[PDB]
């Protein structure tokens, strides 16, 4: 769903 | 690959 | 992008 | 995983 774990790398 | 966009939310 | 390269198996 | 659910589109 989508590439990578998330959006970006990291929070905030 | 995965799920979002990256890693989390956002960098760092 | 789902589960598998298309919708099924094939062209039917 | 990948492109679609399954692969092609059907059972053919």
Redesign the interface.
């Given at each position: 769903?989508x590439?990578x774990?998330x959006?970006x790398?990291x929070?905030x």
């Open positions: 769903a590439v774990w959006w790398w929070w």
